[PDB]
Amino acid sequence: GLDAVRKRPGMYIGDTDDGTGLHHMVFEVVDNAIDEALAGHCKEIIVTIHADNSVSVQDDGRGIPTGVSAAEVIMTVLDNSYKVSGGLHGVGVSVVNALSQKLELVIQREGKIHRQIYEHGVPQAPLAVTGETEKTGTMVRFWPSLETFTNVTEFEYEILAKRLRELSFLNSGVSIRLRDKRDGKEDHFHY
Amino acid sequence: GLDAVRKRPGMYIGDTDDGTGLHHMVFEVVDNAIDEALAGHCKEIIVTIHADNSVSVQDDGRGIPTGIVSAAEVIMTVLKVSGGLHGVGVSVVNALSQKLELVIQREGKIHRQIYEHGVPQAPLAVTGETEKTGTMVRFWPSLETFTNVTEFEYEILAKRLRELSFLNSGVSIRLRDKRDGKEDHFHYE
Ligand SMILES: CNc1cc(F)cc2c1[nH]c1nc(Oc3cnc(C)nc3)nc(N3C[C@H]4CCN[C@H]4C3)c12
Ligand SMILES: CNc1cc(F)cc2c1[nH]c1nc(Oc3cnc(C)nc3)nc(N3C[C@H]4CCN[C@H]4C3)c12
């Protein structure tokens, strides 16, 4: 289960001591958003570096189903990963969840906003309604585990910008915005 | 957990029913040869479509280390290339192969190990002497995993191998197709 992931994190996400695994965390989440974009439902993905050691990835696709919820299953249980050109394989978002000190899932779907929080891949409470909306999509925001990641524990604009540009080229037509609230930088990638 | 790979191959290798996964199996092995080229040791890679439902990939790099189980066995059995299949290793190919053969030329000896469904048939063994170095992986896809397209197709391999050679400039890749009597050579600098 996720216990195995927490025990041997580098095996599942990449080197935890040089920033490689840390940035893979973001790219794995981005891969899920691109997948939803390529399915024709998402027209815009937004990746944001926040000033609190989190990154969020937001799409305006269908929203993960919420009726535990299918969403919780997706987040917690350790599927074609080849729809996304340049996508990571052999990892799902549950690995990112396991290796996050906190992860926040916000889903806009069927008129409601739903939210669930996890810590180290363990939910705090059942998915709950937190608003109403006519919009749709999925937002994952996570704070990396500081037990897991060392030396490079903060997300770096240049690493994210370089890879997101590459992913936008490899998956032509997908629009990715990178917003960096910590550093006051922004980019739009779209080919 | 190779059983996990067999049970749910989609995350690891892709679609198993339309030939895309099947060909990813070849590209994963080729990625390992390209890695050895990027490391500055392999100059030439030979990809061969055999007439027995197998593909071999041979390089002329250092050869996977064989000391002790051997380091080679761990790579095959335990779960930087541009266009590489990121996050998967050759143990995934092994898991989803009916048979896989590893032949290593290293330190003056030829070493061989065979696997069935990712489980070794015997301990790595010496099978010859050589002045050459390199790694050869030859595999036969599992028909319990792959359906509909279960044979390797020249055009799919030719297209992607040309791309991989361009994306990883310097390495020479030969595609030999003994089943169909076709050959090509890809090399960019
Ligand atoms: C930051 N965004 C983000 C982040 C994220 F971690 C996951 C999703 C995610 N956006 C998503 N959108 C959908 O949309 C779907 C809705 N309904 C179905 C049947 N499939 C997909 N599904 C999602 N799922 C369900 C699985 C299908 C393929 N990938 C898995 C994750 C996501
Ligand atoms: C068809 N070819 C092929 C196929 C294949 F499946 C594996 C290799 C392979 N060729 C290889 N050559 C080396 O060479 C090395 C020797 N010594 C060291 C320290 N590193 C690499 N290592 C190999 N290894 C060891 C790991 C390093 C990165 N990739 C893993 C697989 C391969």
Curated annotation (Swiss-Prot), chain A:
Region of interest called ATPase domain, as start-end residue ranges on this chain: 1-191
Binding site for K(+): 74, 77, 90, 94
Binding site residues for ATP: 59, 82, 88-93
Effect of residue 28 to D: 7% supercoiling activity, 16% DNA-dependent ATPase activity, fluoroquinolone-induced DNA cleavage normal, 40% ATP-independent DNA relaxation, binds ATP normally, complements the N4177 ts mutant
Active site: 28 (proton acceptor (atpase activity))
Cystine pairs: none
Binding locations of ADP: 32
Effect of mutating residue 109 to C/H/S: Resistance to coumarin antibiotics, decreased ATPase and DNA supercoiling
Subcellular location: Cytoplasm
Quaternary organization: Heterotetramer, composed of two GyrA and two GyrB chains. In the heterotetramer, GyrA contains the active site tyrosine that forms a transient covalent intermediate with the DNA, while GyrB binds cofactors and catalyzes ATP hydrolysis.
UniProt function note: DNA gyrase negatively supercoils closed circular double-stranded DNA in an ATP-dependent manner to maintain chromosomes in an underwound state. This makes better substrates for topoisomerase 4 (ParC and ParE) which is the main enzyme that unlinks newly replicated chromosomes in E.coli. Gyrase catalyzes the interconversion of other topological isomers of double-stranded DNA rings, including catenanes. Relaxes negatively supercoiled DNA in an ATP-independent manner.
Note: When the enzyme transiently cleaves DNA a phosphotyrosine bond is formed between GyrA and DNA in an ATP-independent manner. In the presence of quinolones this intermediate can be trapped and is used as an indicator of drug toxicity.
Domain observations: Consists of 3 domains; the ATPase domain (residues 1-220), the transducer domain (221-392) and the toprim domain (393-804). ATP-binding is cooperative, and both subunits must be wild-type at residue 103 for supercoiling to occur. Non-hydrolyzable ATP analogs (and ATP-binding) induce dimerization and enhance ATPase activity. ATP hydrolysis induces domain shifts that are probably part of the mechanism of DNA cleavage and rejoining.
Family named by the database record: Belongs to the type II topoisomerase family.
Protein name per UniProt: DNA gyrase subunit B
Curated annotation (Swiss-Prot), chain B:
ATPase domain: annotated segments: 1-189
List of residues binding K(+): 75, 78, 87, 91
GO MF term set: ATP binding; ATP-dependent activity, acting on DNA; DNA binding; DNA negative supercoiling activity; DNA topoisomerase type II (double strand cut, ATP-hydrolyzing) activity; metal ion binding
GO BP field: DNA topological change; DNA-templated DNA replication; DNA-templated transcription; response to antibiotic; response to xenobiotic stimulus
Quaternary structure note: Heterotetramer, composed of two GyrA and two GyrB chains. In the heterotetramer, GyrA contains the active site tyrosine that forms a transient covalent intermediate with the DNA, while GyrB binds cofactors and catalyzes ATP hydrolysis.
Keyword Oxidoreductase: no
Binding site for ADP: 32
Keywords: Antibiotic resistance, ATP-binding, Cytoplasm, DNA-binding, Isomerase, Magnesium, Metal-binding, Nucleotide-binding, Potassium, Sodium, Topoisomerase
Residues the record marks as active site: 28
Span covered, complete protein: 15 to 219 of 804
Top-rank lineage group of the source organism: Bacteria
Protein role: DNA gyrase negatively supercoils closed circular double-stranded DNA in an ATP-dependent manner to maintain chromosomes in an underwound state. This makes better substrates for topoisomerase 4 (ParC and ParE) which is the main enzyme that unlinks newly replicated chromosomes in E.coli. Gyrase catalyzes the interconversion of other topological isomers of double-stranded DNA rings, including catenanes. Relaxes negatively supercoiled DNA in an ATP-independent manner.
Other noteworthy facts: When the enzyme transiently cleaves DNA a phosphotyrosine bond is formed between GyrA and DNA in an ATP-independent manner. In the presence of quinolones this intermediate can be trapped and is used as an indicator of drug toxicity.
Binding-site positions, ATP: 59, 85-90
Record's GO cellular component terms: chromosome; cytoplasm; cytosol; DNA topoisomerase type II (double strand cut, ATP-hydrolyzing) complex
Tagged with keyword Transmembrane: no
Record remark: domains: Consists of 3 domains; the ATPase domain (residues 1-220), the transducer domain (221-392) and the toprim domain (393-804). ATP-binding is cooperative, and both subunits must be wild-type at residue 103 for supercoiling to occur. Non-hydrolyzable ATP analogs (and ATP-binding) induce dimerization and enhance ATPase activity. ATP hydrolysis induces domain shifts that are probably part of the mechanism of DNA cleavage and rejoining.
Protein name: DNA gyrase subunit B
Subcellular location: Cytoplasm
Primary site of residence: cytoplasm
Family, similarity comment: Belongs to the type II topoisomerase family.
